[PDB]
Amino acid sequence: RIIVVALYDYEAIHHEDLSFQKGDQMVVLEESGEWWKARSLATRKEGYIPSNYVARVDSLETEEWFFKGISRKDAERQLLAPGNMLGSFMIRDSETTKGSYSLSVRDYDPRQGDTVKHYKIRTLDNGGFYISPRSTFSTLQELVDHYKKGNDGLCQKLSVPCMSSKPQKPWEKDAWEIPRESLKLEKKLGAGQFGEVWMATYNKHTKVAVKTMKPGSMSVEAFLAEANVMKTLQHDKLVKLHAVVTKEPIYIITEFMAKGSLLDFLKSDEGSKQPLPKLIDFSAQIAEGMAFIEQRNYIHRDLRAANILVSASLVCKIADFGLARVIPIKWTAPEAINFGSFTIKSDVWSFGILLMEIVTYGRIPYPGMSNPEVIRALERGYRMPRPENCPEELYNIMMRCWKNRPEERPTFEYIQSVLDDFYTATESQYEEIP
Ligand SMILES: COc1cc(-c2nn([C@H]3CC[C@H](N4CCN(C)CC4)CC3)c3ncnc(N)c23)ccc1NC(=O)c1cc2ccccc2n1C
Ligand SMILES: [Ca+2]
């Protein structure tokens, strides 16, 4: 008999899903991935729940101050998000020391400003935890209680856990292919050569974006096999593919991103208020999604700010992964223009051009130059000059992306790592403490 507790409130919106409140316990009847079948102990109702809204009773996940599967760089992002404060903290899974835990605390340095600091939490036998050998605790819960009153060596005494908002509800179960009838397409957001993008609603309670495909050269079955495969390549930095309407014209359904494209966003008023570190943070999120593509041995083919989407919390996600592989020379590598050699390394070239888009708040690449003019300039070894608000070191990344030989271009794994810690010396990623 397996009992889970509700981490968040959930209101049912489908046929068989259960509503519940935070703290509700439930008996697990089935584990089916995204949705579990359960019995509420509160309502005695049987039905489906999102499994990301529950954790085993008394597991660490149930604690306000604990964040499962969260990286150094995400801890920092979350802790730097609106809603938090000096001393805001989390205990999380250690990223570099598998099986152990780390503390992340919101701090403030005069010389640099709001920062997040990291402390290794240490474990062995005894089942105990210490950050510094003298100060020892039986449970993680005792550790947090300590560094809540007074900062015994810590940069900052702990105040309140980091802020969590509720996770995205998973798409309805068994609803990869849906009837068109399930959709209300409410606002045309854009339209072009291959179809349209619309703001829609799926069965009344879910806002989605819908891409409608003009019937083209491509087959129907040939288009769905790619979507089918693309849907399995889920990542936090790729827009979520939810569903498809298989009858012509093909509708593609993704999560809705509140801020539209990175390009429009950068050019908006709020866009122009983003300081360089944030612009750098955006690049790092994009590099992360591309690291993932890279590691799975895939290729985007059409990387640029028009194909990056911004959520309302300002999370960047790569869009149109898969599409340019079924179906703009200024973002394309010379080998790809000249011979059609598209590779992860030609995506790397595109990433450098996008990095320039971000630093220039959406200015077109090679301003005042035509496509032909660009082709020849690059052949003569020209590169865009460093803009004003661009640190030399950020510009060197761009230059490395634009090496004429594709083999000499960095990997996205290395770009991400450079972008992630652009203001942090390796030695300084984790605080010391006697
Ligand atoms: C639902 O499908 C998609 C939707 C979007 C999308 N575009 N826009 C704006 C962006 C600015 C635009 N415009 C810019 C210019 N300004 C001036 C006006 C506004 C208007 C439209 C959005 N706004 C909010 N949420 C969204 N999800 C989107 C992008 C890609 C896909 N599809 C895929 O990614 C995809 C297709 C696909 C096909 C096959 C396999 C995989 C596949 N995938 C992952
Ligand atoms: Ca250190």
Kindly write down the DSSP assignment for every residue of 240-260, as one continuous string. PEEEEE-SSSPEEEEE--TT-
Q: Which residue has tokens 């973002």? A: 331
Q: Which one-letter DSSP state was computed for residue 412? A: H
| From-to residues of CATH 3.30.200.20 in the chain | 175-260
Residue pair 355/303 in contact (Cβ under 8 Å)? The answer is no
Backbone angles phi, psi at 3, to 5 degrees: -110, 125
Token digits of residue 120 = 């290794």
Closest among 72, 54, 63 to 3, alpha carbons compared? 54
Closest CA to 349 of 293, 292, 265, 408: 408
Greatest alpha-carbon span in the chain = 73
| Buried-state track 154-168, b at ≥16 Cβ within 10 A, e below 16 | bbbbbeebbeeeeee
207: how many CB neighbours lie within 10 A of its CB?
A: 12
Strands 251-255 and 241-245: antiparallel
The alpha carbons of the chain give a radius of gyration, in whole angstroms, of 24
Distance of CA 73 to the CA centre of its chain: 11
CA dist 303 and 280 (Å) reads 17
> Would you tell me the crossing angle of helices 392-401 and 412-420 to the nearest 10 degrees?
170
Distance CA(99)–CA(236), nearest Å, equals 22
For residue 315, how many C-alpha atoms fall within 13 Å in the half-sphere facing its CB? 19
For residue 319, the CA-to-ligand 1 centroid distance in Å is 6
Q: What is the DSSP secondary structure assignment for residue 261, as one 8-state letter?
A: B
Q: Report CA torsion sign: 381, 386, 392, 394.
A: negative
Q: What is the enclosing helix (H) or strand (E) of 289?
A: helix 276-295
Q: What CA–CA distance (Å, rounded) separates 287 from 174?
A: 32
- Residues counted in the chain: 434
Q: How far apart are CA 416 and CA 235, in angstroms?
A: 15
Question: For domain 175-260, is the CATH number 2.40.50.100?
Answer: no
Bridge-based pairing of strands 129-130 and 136-137 is: antiparallel
In angstroms, the CA 401 to CA 124 distance is 44
CA distances from 279 to 261, 366, 389 (A): 14, 20, 11
What SS3 class is residue 29? strand
From the list 410, 241, 371, 417, the residue with the least C-alpha distance to 317 is 241
Rounded CA-CA distance 315/74 in Å is: 11
| Dihedral pair phi/psi, residue 354, rounded to 5° | -65, -45
What stretch(es) of the chain map to CATH 1.10.510.10? 261-422
- What is the Cα 35 distance to its own chain's centre? 22
> For residue 262, which ligand has an atom nearest its CA?
1
* 261-422 under CATH 1.10.510.10, yes or no: yes
CA distances from 82 to 106, 186, 313 (A): 12, 31, 9
For residue 264, the ligand 1 atom closest to its alpha carbon is: 16
Q: How many Cα neighbours within 13 Å face the side chain of 391?
A: 11
**Could you give the CA distance from residue 383 to residue 378 in angstroms, rounded to a whole number?**
7
285 token code pair: 């999120």
Contact between residue 392 and residue 383 where contact means Cβ atoms under 8 Å apart: no
- Whole-angstrom Cα distance, residue 85 to residue 83? 7
Using CA atoms, how far apart are residues 66 and 86, in angstroms rounded to an integer? 18
The tokens describing 313, both together, are 């919390």
* Closest to 283 measured CA to CA, from 302, 268, 266, 258: 266
Core vs surface per residue 8-25: b (16+ CB within 10 A) or e: bebeeebeebbbbeeebb
Kindly report, as residue ranges, where domains of CATH 3.30.505.10 are found in the chain.
Answer: 63-164
**Position 208, amino acid:** V
Q: Where in the chain is the domain with CATH 2.30.30.40?
A: 1-62
Distance CA 2, CA 9 (A): 20
Calpha distance 355→283 (Å, rounded): 7
CATH node for 1-62: 2.30.30.40
In single-letter form, the type of residue at position 135 comes to S
**How many other C-beta atoms lie within 10 A of the C-beta of residue 138?**
11
How was this model experimentally determined?
X-ray
Best of 168, 176, 197, 264 for a ligand 1 pocket test (most atoms within 8 Å of beta carbon): 197
Considering only CA atoms, which of 233, 232, 198 is closest in space to residue 213? 198
In DSSP notation, 161-190 reads BPP-PPPPPPP-TT-SB--GGGEEEEEEEE
Q: What are phi and psi of 285, to 5 degrees?
A: -70, -45
User: In sequence order, what DSSP letters do the residues of 47-97 get, joined into one string?
Assistant: EEEEGGGEEETTSGGGSTTEETT--HHHHHHHHTSTT--TT-EEEEE-SSS
Distance, in Å, from the CA atom of 39 to the CA atom of 17, rounded to the nearest integer, reads 11
CA of 284 to the centre of ligand 2 (A): 22
Beta strand 101-109 pairing with 113-121: antiparallel
Which positions are annotated as active-site residues? 302
CB-neighbour burial class of residue 132 (10 A; exposed 0-12, middle 13-18, buried 19+):
middle
Number of C-beta neighbours around residue 389 at 10 A = 12
State phi, psi for 306 to the nearest 5 degrees. -55, -30
85 to 106, 155, 156, 158: CA distances (angstroms): 7, 14, 11, 10
Q: Are 62 and 55 in contact (CB under 8 A)?
A: yes
Q: Which residues contact 343 (CB under 8 A, 6 or more apart)?
A: 299, 335, 336, 406
Alpha carbons 218 and 240: distance in angstroms, whole number: 23
Q: Sign (positive/negative) of CA torsion 59, 63, 69, 71?
A: negative
Do residues 70 and 101 make contact, with C-beta atoms less than 8 angstroms apart? no
Which residue type does 35 have?
W
- Cα separation, 221 vs 72, whole angstroms: 42
Q: What is the DSSP letter of 18?
A: P
Annotated resolution, angstroms: 2.3
Which of 188, 299, 309, when mutated, tests ligand 1's pocket best, judged by the most ligand atoms within 8 Å of its CB? 309
Q: Does residue 281 contact residue 256 with C-beta atoms inside 8 Å?
A: no
Which structure tokens are listed for 358? Answer: 């971000």
Q: Which residues line ligand 1 (CB under 6 A)?
A: 189-190, 197, 209-211, 226-227, 230, 239, 241, 252-254, 256-257, 260-261, 264, 309, 319-323, 326
- Quote the ligand 1 centre to 317 CA distance (angstroms): 11
In angstroms, the CA 209 to CA 188 distance is: 10
Q: Which ligand is nearest to the CA of 429?
A: 2
63-164: in CATH 3.30.505.10: yes
What is the Cα–Cα distance from 339 to 351, expressed in whole angstroms? 20
DSSP letters, 123-153, are: --STT-EESSTTSEESSHHHHHHHTTSS-SS
Contact 348, 332 (CB under 8 A): no
Q: Kindly report the protein residue whose alpha carbon is nearest to atom 9 of ligand 1.
A: 260
Helix orientation angle between 276-295 and 412-420, rounded to the nearest 10 degrees: 150
